[PDB]
Amino acid sequence: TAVYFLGFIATIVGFEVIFARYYLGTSIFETLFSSLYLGAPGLLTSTKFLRSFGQTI
Amino acid sequence: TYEQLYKEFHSSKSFQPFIHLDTQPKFAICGLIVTLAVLSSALFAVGSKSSYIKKLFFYTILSVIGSLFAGLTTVFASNSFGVY
Amino acid sequence: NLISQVANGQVLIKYDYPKSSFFKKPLSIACYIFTALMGVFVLKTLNMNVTN
Ligand SMILES: CCCCCCCCCCCCCC(=O)O[C@H](COC(=O)CCCCCCCCCC)COP(=O)(O)OCC[N+](C)(C)C
Ligand SMILES: CCCCCCCCCCCCCC(=O)O[C@H](COC(=O)CCCCCCCCCC)COP(=O)(O)OCC[N+](C)(C)C
Ligand SMILES: CCCCCCCCCCCCCC(=O)O[C@H](COC(=O)CCCCCCCCCC)COP(=O)(O)OCC[N+](C)(C)C
Ligand SMILES: CCCCCCCCCCCCCC(=O)O[C@H](COC(=O)CCCCCCCCCC)COP(=O)(O)OCC[N+](C)(C)C
Numbered sequence: 263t264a265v266y267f268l269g270f271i272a273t274i275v276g277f278e279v280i281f282a283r284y285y286l287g288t289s290i291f292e293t294l295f296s297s298l299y300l301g302a303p304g305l306l307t308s309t310k311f312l313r314s315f316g317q318t319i
Numbered sequence: 320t321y322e323q324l325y326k327e328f329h330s331s332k333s334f335q336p337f338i339h340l341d342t343q344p345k346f347a348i349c350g351l352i353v354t355l356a357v358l359s360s361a362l363f364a365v366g367s368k369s370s371y372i373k374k375l376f377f378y379t380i381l382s383v384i385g386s387l388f389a390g391l392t393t394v395f396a397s398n399s400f401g402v403y
Numbered sequence: 404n405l406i407s408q409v410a411n412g413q414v415l416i417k418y419d420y421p422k423s424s425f426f427k428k429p430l431s432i433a434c435y436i437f438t439a440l441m442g443v444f445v446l447k448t449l450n451m452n453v454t455n
Binding site: 321324325328361362365375378382383385386387389390391393394 | 415417428429430431432433434436437440441443444447448
């Protein structure tokens, strides 16, 4: 479960990069579609990491 | 060019439809019951059988039957409102 | 430039229409319904709990 943690950092950093790239010059629908395609696998992976690690939080 | 088509037009017979237009509002309500029964029993078996293979099996088969009756249901059910 | 009762005429089109494509309309609706049920099957049976 270190690869799941590796899949947990990358989605939060990924949800900051598309906000910065939104701040520079892009329109809305590219931000929103990129947020969907990044949005779903990070949901499944991050949920399974918080379930896996668990008791020491 | 015009004469071959024009003598080929009177040499033919008329057009017989597949199902007459005044019959279709019986098949509409006679389809809408069956597709609700089959599709309702399809989404009903998604509960906790805790057996993955037979649940995918039964759900796929009853979804196939429900789809192929919903198609004919909406085709006959659209010609009796006035949008062909 | 054509007038009411002196240029009425007909127009003739010849075409073909097989028995194959006569039955493709309810199979098109039926394939969209069938590919709509499987999303509810995959979306419904998938783990989203955060506790154990
Ligand atoms: C089903 C439809 C729902 C209807 C809801 C109401 C929709 C209308 C409200 C919009 C109000 C006007 C806002 C506005 O004028 O700006 C719009 C930006 O347009 C927007 O996206 C407004 C975003 C408002 C904040 C959203 C908060 C929700 C949190 C989402 C995670 C223009 O965006 P753009 O100019 O296209 O993007 C360029 C922006 N740069 C910073 C890159 C320059
Ligand atoms: C299980 C059944 C599946 C769903 C059934 C599908 C319903 C069929 C209606 C689809 C949408 C039609 C919308 C519509 O514009 O219809 C109106 C004429 O207006 C009408 O008569 C529409 C009345 C429809 C009543 C709907 C009842 C509620 C159905 C919700 C499930 C006709 O307008 P026009 O499009 O201008 O017709 C002439 C133009 N032609 C190109 C055809 C020459
Ligand atoms: C989710 C629940 C939503 C329910 C919403 C309830 C809305 C109630 C009001 C509906 C408005 C009526 C629509 C309507 O105008 O229908 C009438 C008369 O139509 C008929 O002849 C009845 C045919 C019914 C067929 C059954 C279809 C069931 C599937 C629908 C979901 C059209 O018939 P006519 O106006 O006579 O058009 C003549 C066309 N011929 C081909 C017959 C010549
Ligand atoms: C504004 C709304 C947008 C939300 C987008 C996510 C949508 C999730 C929808 C969840 C559907 C409900 C199912 C569910 O309960 O899952 C939640 C789910 O708990 C959560 O909320 C965590 C979801 C976020 C995952 C973390 C990754 C970060 C997401 C990207 C920003 C976890 O709660 P449970 O694990 O079920 O609680 C304990 C178990 N009981 C048996 C007691 C119920």
